[PDB]
RNA sequence: GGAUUAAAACUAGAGUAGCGAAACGGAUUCGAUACCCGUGUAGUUCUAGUAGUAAACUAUGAAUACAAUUAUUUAUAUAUAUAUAUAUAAAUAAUAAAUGAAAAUGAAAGUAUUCCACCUGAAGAGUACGUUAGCAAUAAUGAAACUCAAAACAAUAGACGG
């Protein structure tokens, strides 16, 4: 769901403004892939599976009995009195989805505004979804993949 | 809009009502 | 004009399901609050029998005259008579009867067919209220929304299980047109189907 | 990441779940039925004070 | 090749051998920068008049067949429209039979109640004669009649107790058996899992081959399937 | 006390023991013990 | 030493409750996020306080 | 699209104490077609309808996810050394952050998402014409020409206030 992803993007911005060290997001494949990309890129300190009440200390298998109570817990980073994850916005919106070929993704990473999408800025992360997998735009260009431009994180 | 500005619309509405009453009267005599 | 004009609120007149449930509520010895006379007669006889047995174990004011025990039964059956209780109790019994005629299994209360049947009972009761309270617009609005809610649940059923859908609407006295077509229960409907009569 | 997101209930787990859920519904129905009979008994004890003739 | 479209039949039975099919195509709207779906209804030739409203069909371009017909039905991808027609006819017959049976069960119940209202005899009085005749020795013909009103040929203290039995009593025992089974299944599996040695033996005894070489989930399900096959099949 | 109660206004325990052959299977048991 | 942030799953409550019913599904409280409890200063309690009073 | 919709008004049949457009009088006044006083008709009331308009206002469309505190009630639940205590929601008040032209908003007028309605200088104008609906009053829809470089909001310091 792009709506759920929009909710998570706004939630992370709200948490950064108040500078909470730990927060939770919905437990879904897309959310987990989204969070994992942020973790590998250094935007998130930690990524743990858990419940509504907090991160799990020991592995708890997820089943239909507890799926409704599952959450993903992420740790936010702050350095030099500044949040590492300052902004998080969707590019492809629920009511206007944007699919780009690899050629247009290369233009976006080169400073060209494609379909009103402002080009990639220094130190910014743009994520792309292709065949239900989320990857960095630079990685999609390396794999010659065409996909939906989901969001941009800075 | 403020009361001051409302008063301009009030005057226009009053004059339209006054003119329609006047027209009605004429129709009665001319009818 | 040859179209099958089925009242979207009350359905076809003389629907066997609607008529039979109504008749069941008006049977001579129907009781309210979940009691059935057969279970109440055995239970009251058991109390007397049980008391005698308890008086033949630790025992050695005689027994009550049978006429007095018959009057205690008459008081219990008058207090629990459906004909002496609120109309809401009768509707509660109808909802149970309707649910059991449509349920897929014991305990099925959320299937679309069961929901539609339970809504039908309340729609029928609410429509009767409106016919006697034609100026009660607050409850007319409730009726409209309830009728539209029944349409929504049945429309989903048609998508999910078409075979059950056609069976359900036939038993409830409705037709596909009554469900699919937009309905506002407006003033033209009240005059074309003579909701209030004359 | 390699862990599956959801593990479907095994057929046996679904059987035990249905047993518990059926029991829960049956117990509540029984307890309400017995409560009603206990109120019918307490009403019989006082029906000698009620007038029908 | 001939241009083929996919669409939903939205009108049928109004024109002879003609149906209206709704085709939706994907287009880009430059103004709003969004890829939209554009809809159009096509008049389509149905040579066999097989299609029905609601069906999903593929239409293929053909020669001009009329002023406005330039496509024909080429295949029924999904036949939901045809299914609707079949289920409606069956419903009328199926419901009529059920309503007839229910109408006959209602009149029968009414007759039984009416018949009982014609018998002034009451359970309490009848149970007060079977308990006085059984304590006094008198055997008026009423008892023989009572032995027919209820079918109780023998008049003993253990016959009035079986005339006044309430269903609630049976429910109370079925509920205890249900609770026992669940409790036993859980305790059994709980204990088995606590002792890996008794678990490995348990599986082998019930016919598992080398249960030792199994996963926690691949083997706990076997234990659960066995514990529920040793407390529900034997009972 | 339940079934074996002395209250004039008893509970359903007494009626349940009657129909369950308990107030009778205990009366005989007590009497047999007295024997 | 009470643990904060731990949710008892239905799998951990196999036995019936004080009402005689089994728990087969999460309740509404279990489905509300409890992040706030992680950040609220814990109320310190002591058994000795009860004896002192 | 449909339904409901204050007050006034209208169509019939009742009712009519008090109040009270209008009208006729008494005062006040330079004058008083007013403010005050009297007599007081419609109306205000009921029954059956028409009509669908209000500063019909929170001048703030609905829905969902989310974000830092306090206080005060309310509800549910829990506990006991039995009346408090501990929890979880709702409401209200004051706020942090954020937002904003500011006044301020404060769980939205914040961070986001989805859908609908609406706006594009003033005046002309919610007017003219046409159309639709209504017994009617009217209601809805709704322009252009000419003219002008205006027009408007928040806030600031004054001046003034019967
Ligand atoms: K032709
Ligand atoms: K009057
Ligand atoms: K709206
Ligand atoms: Mg304005
Ligand atoms: Mg709905
Ligand atoms: Mg008022
Ligand atoms: Mg009149
Ligand atoms: Mg005058
Ligand atoms: Mg004068
Ligand atoms: Mg006056
Ligand atoms: Mg009206
Ligand atoms: Mg007006
Ligand atoms: Mg208006
Ligand atoms: Mg108001
Ligand atoms: Mg709603
Ligand atoms: Mg107008
Ligand atoms: Mg100002």
Curated annotation (Swiss-Prot), chain C:
Keywords (A to Z) from UniProt: Mitochondrion, Ribonucleoprotein, Ribosomal protein, RNA-binding, rRNA-binding, Transit peptide
Assigned GO CC terms: mitochondrial inner membrane; mitochondrial small ribosomal subunit; mitochondrion
Broad class of the protein's primary localization: mitochondrion
Q: Where found?
A: Mitochondrion
List, in alphabetical order, the Gene Ontology terms for molecular function in this entry: rRNA binding; structural constituent of ribosome
Q: Which GO BP annotation is one of this protein's?
A: mitochondrial translation
What the entry says about post-translational processing?
The precursor is processed in two steps involving mitochondrial intermediate peptidase (MIP) and mitochondrial processing peptidase (MPP).
Report quaternary structure and partners. Component of the mitochondrial small ribosomal subunit (mt-SSU). Mature yeast 74S mitochondrial ribosomes consist of a small (37S) and a large (54S) subunit. The 37S small subunit contains a 15S ribosomal RNA (15S mt-rRNA) and 34 different proteins. The 54S large subunit contains a 21S rRNA (21S mt-rRNA) and 46 different proteins.
Q: Which family does it belong to?
A: Belongs to the universal ribosomal protein uS15 family.
As a miscellaneous remark, the entry gives: Present with 6960 molecules/cell in log phase SD medium.
The name of this protein is Small ribosomal subunit protein uS15m
The organism named in the record is Saccharomyces cerevisiae (strain ATCC 204508 / S288c)
Swiss-Prot record, chain E:
Which residue ranges run through the membrane?
A: none
Cellular compartment(s):
Mitochondrion
Which UniProt key words apply to this protein?
Answer: Mitochondrion, Ribonucleoprotein, Ribosomal protein, RNA-binding, rRNA-binding, Sporulation
Query: Which miscellaneous remark does the UniProt record hold?
Result: Present with 2810 molecules/cell in log phase SD medium.
Predominant cellular place of this UniProt entry's protein: mitochondrion
Q: Which Pfam families match?
A: Ribosomal_S17
Name of the protein described by the UniProt record: Small ribosomal subunit protein uS17m
Fill in the subunit field for this protein.
Component of the mitochondrial small ribosomal subunit (mt-SSU). Mature yeast 74S mitochondrial ribosomes consist of a small (37S) and a large (54S) subunit. The 37S small subunit contains a 15S ribosomal RNA (15S mt-rRNA) and 34 different proteins. The 54S large subunit contains a 21S rRNA (21S mt-rRNA) and 46 different proteins.
Instruction: Please name the GO terms of the biological process aspect recorded for this protein, alphabetically.
Output: mitochondrial translation; sporulation resulting in formation of a cellular spore
Domain of life assignment: Eukaryota
Q: Which PANTHER family match?
A: 40S RIBOSOMAL PROTEIN S11 FAMILY MEMBER, SMALL RIBOSOMAL SUBUNIT PROTEIN US17M
> Which Gene Ontology terms cover its molecular function?
rRNA binding; structural constituent of ribosome
Q: Which family does it belong to?
A: Belongs to the universal ribosomal protein uS17 family.
Do you know which InterPro entries this protein is assigned to? Answer: NA-bd_OB-fold (IPR012340), Ribosomal_uS17 (IPR000266)
- Quote a single Gene Ontology cellular component term: mitochondrial inner membrane
Q: Which organism is it from?
A: Saccharomyces cerevisiae (strain ATCC 204508 / S288c) (Baker's yeast)
Swiss-Prot record, chain F:
Q: Which residues of the full protein are shown?
A: 266 to 300 of 318
Q: State the oligomer form and interacting partners.
A: Component of the mitochondrial small ribosomal subunit (mt-SSU). Mature yeast 74S mitochondrial ribosomes consist of a small (37S) and a large (54S) subunit. The 37S small subunit contains a 15S ribosomal RNA (15S mt-rRNA) and 34 different proteins. The 54S large subunit contains a 21S rRNA (21S mt-rRNA) and 46 different proteins.
Q: What else is known?
A: Present with 2010 molecules/cell in log phase SD medium.
Q: What does this protein do?
A: Component of the mitochondrial ribosome (mitoribosome), a dedicated translation machinery responsible for the synthesis of mitochondrial genome-encoded proteins, including at least some of the essential transmembrane subunits of the mitochondrial respiratory chain. The mitoribosomes are attached to the mitochondrial inner membrane and translation products are cotranslationally integrated into the membrane.
List where in the cell it is found.
Mitochondrion
Family assignment from sequence similarity: Belongs to the mitochondrion-specific ribosomal protein mS26 family.
- Organism, as annotated: Saccharomyces cerevisiae (strain ATCC 204508 / S288c) (Baker's yeast)
The protein in question is named Small ribosomal subunit protein mS26
Swiss-Prot record, chain G:
Region forming the signal peptide? none
Location(s), subcellular:
Mitochondrion
What is known about its subunit structure?
Component of the mitochondrial small ribosomal subunit (mt-SSU). Mature yeast 74S mitochondrial ribosomes consist of a small (37S) and a large (54S) subunit. The 37S small subunit contains a 15S ribosomal RNA (15S mt-rRNA) and 34 different proteins. The 54S large subunit contains a 21S rRNA (21S mt-rRNA) and 46 different proteins.
What function does the entry list?
Answer: Component of the mitochondrial ribosome (mitoribosome), a dedicated translation machinery responsible for the synthesis of mitochondrial genome-encoded proteins, including at least some of the essential transmembrane subunits of the mitochondrial respiratory chain. The mitoribosomes are attached to the mitochondrial inner membrane and translation products are cotranslationally integrated into the membrane.
Q: Which family does it belong to?
A: Belongs to the mitochondrion-specific ribosomal protein mS23 family.
- What other note does the entry give for this protein? Present with 1920 molecules/cell in log phase SD medium.
- What is the official name of this protein in its record? Small ribosomal subunit protein mS23
Q: Organism, per UniProt?
A: Saccharomyces cerevisiae (strain ATCC 204508 / S288c)
């Amino acid at each position: 769901s792009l709506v759920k992803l929009a909710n998570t993007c706004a939630h992370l911005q709200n948490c950064s403004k108040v500078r909470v060290a730990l927060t939770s997001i919905p437990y879904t494949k897309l959310q987990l892939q989204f969070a994992y990309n942020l973790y590998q890129q250094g935007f998130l300190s930690s990524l743990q599976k858990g419940s509504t009440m907090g991160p799990d200390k020991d592995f708890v298998e997820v089943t239909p009995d507890n799926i409704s109570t599952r959450r993903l817990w992420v740790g936010l980073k702050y350095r030099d009195n500044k949040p590492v994850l300052s902004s998080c916005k969707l590019i492809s919106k629920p009511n206007s989805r944007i699919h780009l070929p690899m050629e247009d993704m290369k233009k976006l990473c080169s400073g060209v505004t494609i379909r009103n999408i402002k080009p990639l800025q220094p130190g910014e992360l743009i994520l792309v979804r292709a065949h239900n997998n989320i990857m960095d735009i630079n990685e999609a260009i390396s794999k010659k993949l065409d996909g939906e431009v989901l969001c941009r994180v800075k | 809009d403020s009361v001051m500005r409302k008063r301009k619309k009030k005057m226009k509405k009053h004059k339209l009502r006054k003119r329609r009453k006047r027209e009605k009267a004429e129709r009665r005599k001319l009818s | 004009a040859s179209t099958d004009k089925v009242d979207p609120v009350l359905g076809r007149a003389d629907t066997p399901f609607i008529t039979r449930i109504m008749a069941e509520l008006k049977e001579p010895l129907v009781l309210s609050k979940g009691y059935n006379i057969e279970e109440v007669d055995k239970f009251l006889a058991a109390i007397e029998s049980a008391k005698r047995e308890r008086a033949e174990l630790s025992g050695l004011v005689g027994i009550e005259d049978i006429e007095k025990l018959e009057d205690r039964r008459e008081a219990i059956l008058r207090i629990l008579s459906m004909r002496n209780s609120e109309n809401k109790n009768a509707i509660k019994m109808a909802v149970e009867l309707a649910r059991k005629e449509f349920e897929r299994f014991p305990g099925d209360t959320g299937s679309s067919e069961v929901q539609a049947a339970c809504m039908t009972v309340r729609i029928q009761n609410m429509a009767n209220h409106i016919k006697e309270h034609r100026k009660d617009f607050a409850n007319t609005r409730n009726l409209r929304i309830l009728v539209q809610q029944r349409q929504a649940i049945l429309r989903y059923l048609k998508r999910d299980n078409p075979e059950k859908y056609y069976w359900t609407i036939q038993k409830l006295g409705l037709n596909d047109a009554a469900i699919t077509d937009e309905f506002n229960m407006d003033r033209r409907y009240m005059q074309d189907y003579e909701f209030f009569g004359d | 990441m390699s862990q599956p997101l959801l593990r479907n209930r095994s057929p046996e787990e679904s059987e035990l779940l249905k047993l518990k859920r059926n029991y829960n519904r049956s117990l509540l129905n029984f307890q309400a039925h017995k409560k009603k009979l206990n109120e019918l008994l307490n009403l019989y004890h006082v029906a000698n004070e009620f007038i029908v003739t | 090749a001939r241009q083929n479209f996919l669409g939903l039949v939205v009108s049928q039975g109004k024109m002879q051998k003609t149906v209206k099919v709704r085709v939706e195509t994907k287009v880009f709207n430059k103004k709003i920068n969004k890829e939209l779906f554009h809809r159009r209804d096509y008049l389509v030739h149905d040579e066999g008049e097989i299609s029905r409203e609601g069906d999903l069909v593929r239409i293929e371009a053909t020669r001009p067949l009329s002023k406005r017909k330039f496509f024909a039905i080429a295949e029924i991808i999904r036949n939901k429209g045809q299914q609707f027609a079949l289920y409606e006819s069956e419903a009328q017959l199926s419901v009529a039979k059920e309503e007839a049976q229910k109408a006959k069960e209602f009149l029968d119940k009414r007759s039984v109640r009416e018949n009982k209202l014609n018998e002034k005899t009451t359970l309490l009085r009848d149970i007060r004669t079977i308990q006085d005749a059984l304590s006094s020795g008198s055997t008026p013909k009423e008892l023989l009649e009572i032995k027919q009103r209820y079918g109780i040929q023998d008049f003993s203290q253990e016959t009035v107790r079986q005339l006044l039995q309430l269903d609630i009593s049976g429910l109370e025992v079925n509920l205890e058996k249900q609770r026992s089974l669940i409790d036993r299944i859980q305790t059994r599996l709980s204990e088995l899992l606590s002792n890996d040695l008794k678990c490995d033996q348990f599986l082998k005894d019930h016919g598992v081959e080398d249960p030792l070489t199994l996963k926690k989930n691949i083997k706990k399900n076997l234990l659960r399937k066995h514990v529920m096959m040793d407390m529900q099949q034997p009972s | 006390m339940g079934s074996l109660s002395n209250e004039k206004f008893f509970d359903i325990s007494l009626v349940d023991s009657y129909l369950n052959k308990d107030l009778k299977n205990i009366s005989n048991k007590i009497d047999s013990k007295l024997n | 030493g009470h643990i904060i942030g731990k949710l008892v799953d239905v799998t951990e409550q196999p036995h019936a409750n004080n009402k005689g019913l089994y728990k087969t599904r999460p309740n509404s409280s279990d489905k509300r996020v409890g992040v706030k409890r992680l950040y609220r200063p814990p109320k310190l309690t002591y058994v000795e306080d009860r004896l002192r009073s």
